[PDB]
Symmetry: D2
Subunit: 472 residues, 4 copies
C-alpha cells in the first residue's frame, strides 16, 4: 500500500526534513547578520525565489521554443519566449540584430557552450589573466604546465595582463600578444578588475588579428543593463553572463549573439550575414546540456522584469557610488587600493603595505561575520599567497545601504585589519601560530557582535526576518 | 530620483504581485501537470518539501570548492548541508563510505557525465555506449551517418556505440565484446534511456576487464529503482556511477557522481596495496575544471529527496512503478500491439509503431493534443530523428500521483483510442504529415478524447503543490 | 693550407675510406651468395645506381617544377618532369585525369603526406590489420593501447580483417565496421596478403560510408605496372607506392591523385573538379619534407623507363609463376601456406601447425644465408614471436631464376625448417635453449654451403661480379 | 623468356637512359659554371657519391644494429655502427653521455621524429621565427591562421624574433614569451642568422620554464664539428641536423640525444638518468619511417670520416674567413649587412637602403649565373617582399676559393646590384616593368660571361670537369 500523496508529497519541508530546514534557517540568519562583501554575491528577491521553487522543476522540455523534441510545452514555451525577449529588452538589443539562449545552467556552462559553438577543439583563446582580474573559465594553466580550466584542456589559451604600474589593461601588450598568438577568440570581461572596459579598442584588436570578440559581462551585467557601464553589445560578436551577481537574479547563464547582416568586411561577400544563432543553440543542446531547468528560466524572467525598471537603475548607480565611497574611505585611512579607485561594483585592496596576507584578513573577517575573499594584486602571478582582498557592493546595497553605511563598513574593515595586525604582532607571520589569536579573542568577539548588530538593523530581500526561526 | 526602491517593495513582495505574467503561466503549467496523463519516462512529480528547499535563500551563496576545502568563507552551514547530501546519497544507494564517495555538485545529468569523462579520460580517448536506436542516450556519444558530431561526448572524445541484438532486443554482449576488443575503449558505459530490461553489470565488468576499460554506469533513469533495491545494483561491479536525481529518484534537477575509493580488487600485474584514485580527479573535474559555484538550493533539495528515497514507503512506490509499467505493457500487448522485448523489467514501456504503419511523431503529436504526453523514440533500425518508429512510455510520474495497476490499464485504453484516432486520420487524409495535420483540426473524437483524459487525470492527488489553492480549477 | 680539392673531393672511395669500401664489398658478396627472399627487397639495375650516385645530390630544389623557391633549377625541373610523366605512363594514367608527386623520400613519408593532405588530425582511418597481412603505416595499436604507428598517434585507426576460414579479406565484416566506425579514409593494399584486391568492392564500401579510398600498392607496384595485378587506379582517389620493391627501382615514394572533372554525386556542384593536387603537393612540401632528394628522382626516372618495357612484363609474369611454384612445392611437403596459394609475388607460411614460431625459422635461415622475415598470421599478437614467415620472389627472379630454381629454394626452406624442428626437439622452445643448437651444427654448416653454392651460379644486376673484391 | 640480366641490369646509364644521362651532364655543367651562394648548398666528395650510388640501396634493415626485425644485416650493422660512432667522434661526444640515430631520411624527417619522440600531439613548441632567420620545421603559421608546417599542424608553435633594430636574437623577449606560453620544447638554431648562439642562455631559459632544449644545427653542422662555433652539446638535450650543408655529406639527418646520469636540478631525484634513447629510436622506427636508406648511411659514414680531419677544420676556418671577407667587402662599398658582420658561414645583406627588394636581386643574379636567395631582414614579416638576400660561403669554399676570390665575388655582386638599380631607374619598381630590362640587356650579358669564366677557373669535387660531357 503506497504512502498517500498528501503525506510525502504535500507536507511542508519543516515537517518532512527538520534537519535541512534547520540548516536553511541557520543560513538565513547568517545572511542577514553578516556584512556580505563577496563581489559575486547578491540577495535576490522573494518573487524570483517563488518562481525558482515551483512546479516548473518537473518538466522536461529539450529543444527550443517552437522546435521541441516532445510535447506538453505550451506554457514552458511562453515562459522561455518571455524570458528571452525580456533579456534582449533589459540589454537594449534590437531582436533583429541580437538573439539569446537562456538555457545555460550557470556561467561556466554558458562560457563552455559559447566556446564549443564558435571553435574547434584546440583552437586558440585569449582572456584576462587570473592575477590581473580574469576568471578561470577564460583559460588557466600553472607555471608547471598544469591545465586547471577545462577551457585550457580542450582549447589552447594564453592570458593577457594588466600593466603592473597602473593596474589598467595594457592594451598595447594585448595587441602585441594577439598578433603573435593569433587567437580565434578574444575574451574580454573579468572578475576582479576595478575599471570599465574599452570594447572599441578590443574590437580594433579583434579586427587586426582576425579573432571573434566575446564579452563575459557576468560581474557587471546589472550595471550594463542599467546603462551604468560601457555597452559590450556595441562591439562584441557574443556576450555571455551570469544572472545571479549584479543582475540580482537566480543562478543561471545566458548567451547573447549577433544576427543579421555583417558590417563591411575586408574582401568578403556583400550580403553576408551572421551565423552564430544555430551554432550557439546546438552547442547548448543537444551537444552539451540536457533538459533545461525551467524553474531557473521562469525565475530569470522575473529577475529580468525587475532589472528593467527605473528602480534598478537607481540601485546600479547606488552600487557604484557605494563602491566608490568604500574605496575613498579606505584610502583616507592610508590603505592602498588598486588603481586608486573604482569605476564599478568592486574594490581591490592591496594588503602588502600592511605586512598582511589576504588569507589572514579573509580568515579574521569571516570569524567576525564579514565575508570577502582574498585576491591577487597588481598582476602578481606567483603562488598561493594572495596579497589582497576583493570587496564588492552589490549584496549590501541590495539591503538598502548607501554611502554612509558603506563608510561604516570601511570602519569595520579598519578595525578588522587593525585586529589582524595585532594578532600577527603577538604570534607572528606563520598561519598555524596566527590561528592561536583567533580563538577566545574578546576583541574579535566584540567586533563580531558589533558587525552583527549593524547587519541585523537592515531589511533583507527574499524572506521575512520577522518569520525566521533564529532571530537572536 | 537617486533613492532606491524599498526592500519590502521589490524584495519581499510575492511573485503574484511582482510578475503577474509569470505567475499566471506557472499556474497554467500547474493545472496542465495535474490534468494530463504524463507518460514521459524521464519525468516525475517531486515533493513540496523538495520544492521548498529549492526555492530558498541557499541560492544566494557562493561556495566554490568542497566541504572542508572552500575558496571563500561563510560556508559553515553550506558545508553541513552538502555533507548531509553526500552521506544521504551513499546511504540511499547502500555504499560503504570507506569504499565509495560522491560529488553532488553537477548541475544536471549531462554535466555529471561530461565531468566524469573529463576526470577519467584525456581528450580524444575512446568511449563506447549504448546506441540511441538501441535505447542509449546522447551523452554517451552520438554521431550521424554523415559524420556529424552531435553529442559533445563525440566532439571531445572518440565514441563508438554498441547495440541490442537484432532479434531479441537485448544487449548483444558478444558483439559488444567483439567491438571493444577491436576498438579498445578507455571507458565502457552502461545504462540507457529507453532500454526496457535490466542490465548485467557482471558481464559488463568481465568485458571491461577483458579489454582494459573503466566501467561506468549512468543509472539516471532507474536511480529510484536501484535505491529501492528494485533493480540490479551497478555499484557492485562499476568503477563510477553517474545519475540524475529528478527522474525515478523523484528529486530536484541535479547530477551526482559516485566513485570507488580505497583498495583495488586483485588484478594480475597490479602492484600490491593499490588504491583507487578516482576521488581527486572527479572532484577536480567538477571544480575547478568545468563548473563554477555549486547550486546550493539544488543540493539542499537533493538532500531532502535522498532522505525521502531511503524509506520503506519509497520502496513500495518503486515496486508499484514497475508493476504499473508491466500492467500497461500487458494491456497494450493484449490489444495486439508490439512492445519491445515483449515486456519490461523497469519503469518504462517501449512501443513499436512500425507494424501499424505509423510514425512515432504522429502519435506523439496527437497525444499532446489530447493531454497525453509521451515522446517518440527510436526503435531498432531507425535512421530518422524527426520521425522515428516508436514511442516510449514511463510509469513514475502518474504512479507518484497514486495510480495503481487498474488506473494504468485505463491509461492503456486511452493510448489505444489515441492510436486508433491516429490511424483514422491517416486513413482519411494520407500518410504524409502535411496531409495528416488536417485531421488534427476541428476533430470531434479528438475533442472527446481530450475531455475524457482530463476528467480522468483530475481524479487523483498531486504532489508538490495544493490543487485546492491553484489559480485554475 | 687547405687540403686540395682533388685530394678530398675527387679521390675514389677505395682510397678515401677503405673501411667503408670493404664493408660494401662484403655486402655485395652477401647479396649474390645468399637466397634473398625478403618480399620487399629487389636488386635494382646499374643504370638506376649510376643516377642515384650523382651530382644531383648537390641541388636544393624546394617547390615543384616551374614553381621553385630558389633559382638554378632548369635541369632539376626537366628531370622531375620526366620522372612524373614516366610515372603516369608506367601505370597507364591519362595525365588529364591523374597527377603524381615523386618527391616522398620513401613509402612511409608518402603515406603520411597523403594522410596530412587529406585529413585533419584525429580523423578516422581504416586499414588492413597486421595479422591479416597489413602494414604498420596503415595504423597499428596494441591490445594494451600502445600507439605504435605514427598513423595511430596522429589519427584514429581501426583495422579490418581477413575472414578466418578463407584467408581472404572479409568484405562483409569490413562494410559492417566502416558503417559503425565511419572512417574518413579507407586504405587498401598490404604487405603479406597473398591475393589480389577487389578495388570495385572497396569503392562500393567507401561510397556507402562517405570515405576517401586510398590504395597503397607498394608491394605489387611492379605487377600493377605490368598489368599482372588488378588496377587500383580504376577505383581509388589516391594511390601511394614505394619504388624499390617489385617496381625494381630506387628507394623512394610516390603519391598519385585524380585530377579533372568529378563523377556525379550529390551536393556537388555540376562541373566540380577534384582538389587533390594542391593539397598533396602542399603536404609534401612545405608541410612535411624539405628539399627533394634529386638523385633519387633521377634514378627513379630511369627505373620508370625500365619498368615500361615488354621485358619488365615478362619479369612480372615470371615473379608470379615463381611464387606459385614455390608455394606449390611447400604445400606438397605438407606445409600450410595461407589461402593455400598465391596470386602475387609472395607466399605467406603458417608455422604454428609445425609447433614453430617465425623468429626461430628466420634466425636459422639467416645463419644459412637464407634471408626472409618472420610475419604475423591470423590471430597473432606477438612482436617477437609471430606464427609465420613471409617469402617473396622479386629479388631472386631478378637474378634470372625460374620455376625449377624456386622448387630448389623450397627444398632448402624445407631443409631449414626440419633443422629448426630438430634443434627445438633436442633443446626446447626457450630462446636460450633453442640457441644451443645454432652453434657447432654440422647440418647447419652443410646447408649454408649448399645454399651459397646454389646462389653464386646466377647473374647479378647492379654491379659486376667479375670486378668485386670478394669472390 | 626473360630478358638477360646483363642487358637491363648491368648496362650503364648512358646507353640505358640517354635522356636522364644527358640532363645530369647538363646539371654537372651548371654546377661549375656559376657562383653558388645558397647557404644551404655544398659540393660533396666523389667518395661520398660512390657510397651513395651502391648496392646498399637493395637492403631492407628495419630496426637498429643488433636489434633488427630480420636477417641479412651482418654488414649493414657494421656500417651503421661505424656511422654512429664516427658521428659521435666528429662532434666530440662521450658515447656514455650521448647517442645518435642516423636513420632520418633528411632534416625535416629528423626534426619531426624528434618532436614525435619528445612530445604528445598539440604540445607547445617555440622556435626562431622564419622572418627572423628560423626554419619552417620549427613552426610556421600565417597571419591568416593557415598552418604551414606540419610542426604547426600537429603541435602548437609560437615563434621568437630577432631585435628589429640590431638583428640579434632578443633573448629577453624570448624569456618573456616562454614564461607566458610555457613550451614543452624550446628549439634553437636557424637558417638565415649570421651570429653564433648563446646556448647557456637558452638553457637558463629552458630550465626557468621547464622546457626541453633542442638545437637544430643543420646549417652550422660543419662549423660545430670543426670546433669553429659554439657547441650546442654542452647545453641541449637533443641536437638534430642535416648532413648535406656545411658538413658536406649526403642528404640525410641525424638525431643526437643525451644518455646516462642527469646533472643536478632542483626537484630531480638523485641518480635520475636520461630517457631519450628509446623514445627517439621508436619515433624514427617503427613510428614514422620504414626501411633505412643504407646507401645514405654508408655515404654518411664517409662524410663523417672526412669531417673529422685536420683538413676539414682548415676548411671550416676558411668558410668563416670567406664569409667575413665578403661581408667586410660589401660594407667597404657602402652596402649594409645585418648585425654588421658575421660569425658563421653566411651574410645577410640589407637591400632596403638601396631601394631594392630581394626578389629583384635574386632574379637578376640567376640570369647571370649567381645563385642566392631573397630573405627577410631584421625579422620583418609585414614587408610585401623580402628586403634582403642570403649568401653562403660553404659551396664555393669547397671549390678552393680563399678570401681574395670572395672579394672578387663581392665585386660581381656589386655589379649585379648596380645593374639591378640601372634597370629600376629606367623601368621603375613594378616587376611587370622591371621584367622588361631582363631581356636583350648587353650589360647583363657581360656579367653572365665574366661570372662563367670566373667559375670555370676552379676545380670541382664530386666529379671530373675534364671528363664531363659539356665543356
Ligand atoms: C540530437 N539528435 C537526436 C534527436 C532526437 N529527437 C529529436 N527531435 C526533434 N524534433 N528534432 C531533433 N533534431 C531531434 N534529434 C539528432 C540530431 C540530428 C540527427 C540527424 O542528423 N539525422 C539525419 C540522419 C543522419 C545523416 O544523414 O547524417 C536525418 O535524416 O534525420 C539525428 C539525431
Ligand atoms: C611493431 N610491432 C610489430 C613488430 C614486428 N617485428 C618486430 N621485430 C622485432 N625484433 N621487434 C619488434 N618490436 C617487432 N615488432 C609491434 C610492436 C610492439 C608490440 C608490443 O608492444 N607488445 C606485445 C604484445 C602484448 C600486447 O597485446 O600489447 C609483444 O610482446 O609482442 C607488438 C608488435
Ligand atoms: C541515461 C541518461 N543520462 C543522462 C541524462 C541527462 O539528464 P539531464 O537532462 O539532466 O542533463 C539523461 C536524460 N534523459 C532524458 C532527456 O534526454 C530522457 O527523456 O530520457 C539520460 O536518460
Ligand atoms: C566573469 C565570470 N564568468 C563566469 C563565472 C562563473 O559563474 P558560475 O559560478 O555560475 O559558473 C564567474 C564567477 N565568478 C565567481 C566565482 O569565481 C566570483 O566570485 O568571482 C565569473 O566571475
Ligand atoms: C635549420 C634547418 N633544419 C632543417 C632543414 C631541412 O633539411 P632537409 O631539406 O633535408 O629536410 C633546413 C633546410 N634549409 C634549407 C631549405 O629550407 C635552406 O636553404 O636553409 C634547415 O635550414
Ligand atoms: C604496403 C607498404 N607501404 C609502405 C611501406 C613503407 O615503405 P618504406 O620502407 O620506404 O617506408 C611498406 C614497407 N614494407 C616493407 C618494410 O616494412 C616490408 O618488408 O613489407 C609497405 O609494405
Amino acid at each position: 500500500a503506497m504512502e498517500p500523496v498528501s503525506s510525502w508529497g504535500n507536507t511542508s519541508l519543516v515537517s518532512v526534513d527538520p534537519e535541512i530546514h534547520d540548516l536553511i534557517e541557520k543560513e538565513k540568519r547568517r545572511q542577514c547578520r553578516g556584512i556580505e562583501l563577496i563581489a559575486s554575491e547578491n540577495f535576490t528577491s522573494f518573487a524570483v525565489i517563488e518562481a525558482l521553487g515551483s512546479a516548473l522543476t518537473n518538466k522536461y522540455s529539450e529543444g527550443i521554443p517552437g522546435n521541441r523534441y516532445y510535447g506538453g510545452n505550451e506554457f514552458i514555451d511562453e515562459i522561455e519566449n518571455l524570458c528571452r525577449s525580456r533579456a534582449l529588452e533589459a540589454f537594449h538589443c534590437d531582436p533583429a540584430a541580437w538573439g539569446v539562449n537562456v538555457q545555460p545552467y550557470s556561467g561556466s556552462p554558458a562560457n563552455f557552450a559559447a566556446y564549443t559553438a564558435l571553435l574547434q577543439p584546440h583552437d586558440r583563446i585569449m582572456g584576462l589573466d587570473l592575477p590581473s582580474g580574469g576568471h578561470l573559465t577564460h583559460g588557466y594553466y600553472t607555471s608547471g604546465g598544469k591545465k586547471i580550466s577545462a577551457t585550457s584542456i580542450y582549447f589552447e589559451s594564453l592570458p593577457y595582463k594588466v600593466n603592473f604600474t597602473t593596474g589598467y589593461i595594457d592594451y598595447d601588450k594585448l595587441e602585441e600578444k594577439a598578433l603573435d598568438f593569433r587567437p580565434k577568440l578574444l575574451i574580454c570581461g573579468g572578475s576582479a578588475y576595478p575599471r570599465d572596459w574599452d570594447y572599441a579598442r578590443f574590437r580594433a584588436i579583434a579586427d587586426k588579428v582576425g579573432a571573434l570578440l566575446l564579452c563575459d559581462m557576468a560581474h557587471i551585467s546589472g550595471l550594463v543593463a542599467a546603462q551604468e557601464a560601457a555597452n559590450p553589445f556595441e562591439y562584441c560578436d557574443v556576450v555571455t553572463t551570469t544572472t545571479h551577481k549584479s543582475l540580482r537574479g537566480p543562478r543561471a547563464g545566458m548567451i547573447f549573439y549577433r544576427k543579421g547582416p555583417k558590417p563591411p568586411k575586408k574582401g568578403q561577400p556583400e550580403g553576408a550575414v551572421y551565423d552564430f544563432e544555430d551554432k550557439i543553440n546546438f552547442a547548448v543542446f543537444p551537444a552539451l546540456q540536457g533538459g533545461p531547468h525551467n524553474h531557473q528560466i521562469g525565475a530569470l524572467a522575473v529577475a529580468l522584469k525587475q532589472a528593467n525598471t527605473p528602480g534598478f537603475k537607481v540601485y546600479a548607480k547606488q552600487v557604484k557610488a557605494n563602491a566608490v565611497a568604500l574605496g575613498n574611505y579606505l584610502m583616507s585611512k592610508g590603505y592602498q587600493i588598486v588603481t586608486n579607485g573604482t569605476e564599478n561594483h568592486l574594490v581591490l585592496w592591496d594588503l602588502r603595505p600592511l605586512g598582511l596576507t589576504g588569507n589572514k584578513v579573509e580568515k579574521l573577517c569571516d570569524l567576525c561575520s564579514i565575508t570577502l575573499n582574498k585576491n591577487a594584486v597588481f598582476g602578481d602571478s606567483s603562488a598561493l599567497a594572495p596579497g589582497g582582498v576583493r570587496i564588492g557592493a552589490p549584496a549590501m546595497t541590495s539591503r538598502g545601504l548607501v554611502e554612509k553605511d558603506f563608510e561604516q563598513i570601511g570602519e569595520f574593515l579598519s578595525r578588522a585589519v587593525t585586529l589582524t595586525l595585532d594578532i600577527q604582532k603577538t604570534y607572528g607571520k606563520l598561519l598555524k601560530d596566527f590561528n592561536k589569536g583567533l580563538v577566545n579573542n574578546k576583541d574579535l568577539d566584540q567586533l563580531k557582535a558589533d558587525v552583527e548588530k549593524f547587519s541585523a538593523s537592515y531589511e533583507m530581500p527574499g524572506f521575512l526576518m520577522s518569520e525566521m526561526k533564529y532571530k537572536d
